[PDB]
Design a binder for this molecule. Structure first.
Ligand SMILES: C[C@@H](C#N)CNC(=O)c1ccccc1
Ligand SMILES: C[C@@H](C#N)CNC(=O)c1ccccc1
Lengths: 237, 300
């Protein structure tokens, strides 16, 4: 059934599963036309497909050419997402295919189900969690590869860097969700926290800075404060 | 005009014949139903006074044999049977008619209701959905499940309606996933009409048969089938104009005949609102939309 607080540890068991987030697939800027009407201009997007146990991220870049001459783009975007997730599953060896795909938005359920009819044993699940994966485009290296793309492209990352050498998947996912929640709630402040100290660098092969265990505790506390703070500046508390 | 005699009426029962019904008191001298119009299928149905549970009945066509009803005190129901001795039957009937112990099928001459509800229902096709080949008539009750219901448990006692499933490989061509899900014309016209049903006359008939079993027996799986067959048409952008015009007439008479106090359970809000207001055919069912709005505006 639906994935929620009560079954959260299931994410880190040994049954292969993927989250799919489609909130950055169809991205537009809204602008005025010379005649004073409103129009949109699409910009490159991406499907965010993540193994929460291993950190493996399959980042399918959606190039603006896929929308050319198409109608009802917000609806098409869900079906295009489902087509690409299905294609990814089919590309994986059988022993690497997921047993479950969890969609972050319920509107992806029917498109993904229909595209996965050939995989009756892969469960397609919604979630009650309000996960912050939209903020993925606030990770500088991910945003950069999406905007630079001149054609459809799949790029693989480990969204946990090397954290699993020192922490469990549960703790890694919790840190990821904290960082992304902070970037979503106040991107500028969150990025200030992560890069304030010029002596902590991001390795070429990593997405996040190379914090020590102690510095991660400090960082994580700072992100929590921000999320509470902003919750005051928003609710006046 | 044909006749279905009864041996007797040993238990108190409400008897229906098509859209008509009457109550027969325990051991009341009652000997059957006469003046049944030739040319249509008919249904004779039963609800016992003591156990309103289990409505049950028999679909038949008097052109296919001489049928009568007899109560079985062991299995506890009124059973339809065929009398093969033509002269024995005619003599039984004529005697019961002379003694005026037969209700008269009470058809008004202006009234095309039964024709309009059964236009495409045949006894040969009903026998291909309700399988009991030794009999020329077909038993149906409130509890019988459909083949599709069983996929999700006694097969010989099932309604074999054509399984319709919008999220299935039968419904969705590889490579046309979005197209076929959002516009079911392929599935309606190629898979179902050209490939299974054989023509629209057979699609309309199973849709009519599904409705009548839902209404007369409260058969839940039949109601599911009726609504699925409506939804499959309304969700197709490409439907022959003659089918849409006929569907409007079909549904009009079904909605007109539905008992008002059963609408809550027999009508699926989602299907009807989708069909009348959101679907490709939202503007093609004028008669049905007008009767639905004047008779059941709450559902919408
Ligand atoms: C008056 C009768 C005689 N003799 C003929 N009517 C019926 O047998 C009948 C009519 C209505 C309900 C049940 C039986
Ligand atoms: C299952 C297929 C068969 N036979 C299709 N059903 C019908 O043609 C039909 C079934 C019931 C009444 C009228 C027509």
């Amino acid at each position: 059934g639906a994935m929620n607080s009560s079954n959260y540890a299931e994410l880190f068991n040994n049954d292969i599963k993927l989250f799919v987030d489609d909130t950055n697939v169809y991205r537009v800027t809204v602008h005025k036309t010379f005649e004073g009407n409103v129009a949109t201009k699409a910009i490159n997007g991406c499907i965010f497909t993540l193994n929460p146990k291993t950190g493996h991220l399959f980042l399918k870049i959606i190039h603006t050419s896929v929308w050319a001459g198409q109608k009802r783009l917000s609806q098409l975007a869900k079906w295009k997402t489902a087509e690409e997730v299905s294609a990814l599953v089919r590309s994986l060896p059988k022993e690497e295919q997921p047993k479950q795909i969890i969609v972050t938005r319920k509107a992806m359920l029917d498109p993904l189900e229909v595209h996965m009819l050939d995989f009756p044993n892969i469960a397609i699940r919604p979630t009650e969690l309000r996960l912050p994966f939209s903020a993925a485009m606030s990770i500088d290296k991910l945003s950069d590869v999406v905007m630079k793309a001149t054609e459809p492209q799949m790029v693989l990352f480990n969204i946990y860097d090397d954290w699993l050498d020192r922490i469990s998947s549960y703790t890694a996912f919790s840190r990821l969700t904290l960082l992304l929640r902070a970037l979503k709630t106040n991107e500028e402040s969150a990025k200030m926290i992560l890069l304030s100290d010029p002596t902590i660098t991001i390795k070429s092969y990593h997405l996040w800075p190379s914090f020590t265990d102690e510095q991660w505790i400090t960082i994580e506390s700072q992100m929590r404060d921000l999320i509470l703070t902003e919750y005051g500046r928003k609710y006046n508390v | 005009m044909n006749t279905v005699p009864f041996t007797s009426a040993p238990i108190e029962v409400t008897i229906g014949i098509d859209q008509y019904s009457f109550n027969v008191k325990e051991n009341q001298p009652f000997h059957g139903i006469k003046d049944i119009p030739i040319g249509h299928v008919h249904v004779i149905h039963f609800q016992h006074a003591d156990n309103s549970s289990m409505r049950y009945g028999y679909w038949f066509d008097c052109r296919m044999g001489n049928f009568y009803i007899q109560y079985d005190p062991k299995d506890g129901l009124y059973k339809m049977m065929e009398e093969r001795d033509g002269a024995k039957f005619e003599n039984i009937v004529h005697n019961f008619k002379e003694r005026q112990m037969m209700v008269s099928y009470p058809k008004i001459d202006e009234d095309d209701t039964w024709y309009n509800l059964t236009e495409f229902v045949q006894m040969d096709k009903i026998r291909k959905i309700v399988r009991k080949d030794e009999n020329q008539f077909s038993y149906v009750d409130s509890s019988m499940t459909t083949v599709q219901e069983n996929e999700l448990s006694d097969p010989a006692h099932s309604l074999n309606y054509t399984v319709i499933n919008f999220k299935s490989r039968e419904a969705i061509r590889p490579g046309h996933e979005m197209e076929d899900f959002l516009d079911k014309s392929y599935y309606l016209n190629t898979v179902m009409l050209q490939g299974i049903f054989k023509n629209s006359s057979n699609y309309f008939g199973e849709l009519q048969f599904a409705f009548l079993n839902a209404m007369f027996f409260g058969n839940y799986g039949s109601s599911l089938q009726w609504h699925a067959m409506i939804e499959l048409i309304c969700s197709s952008a490409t439907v022959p104009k003659h089918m849409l015009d006929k569907l409007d007439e079909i549904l009009y008479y079904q909605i007109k005949t539905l008992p008002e106090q059963y609408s809550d359970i027999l009508l699926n809000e989602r299907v009807w609102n989708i069909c009348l207001y959101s679907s490709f055919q939202k503007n093609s069912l004028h008669n049905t939309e007008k009767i639905m709005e004047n008779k059941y505006p709450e559902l919408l």
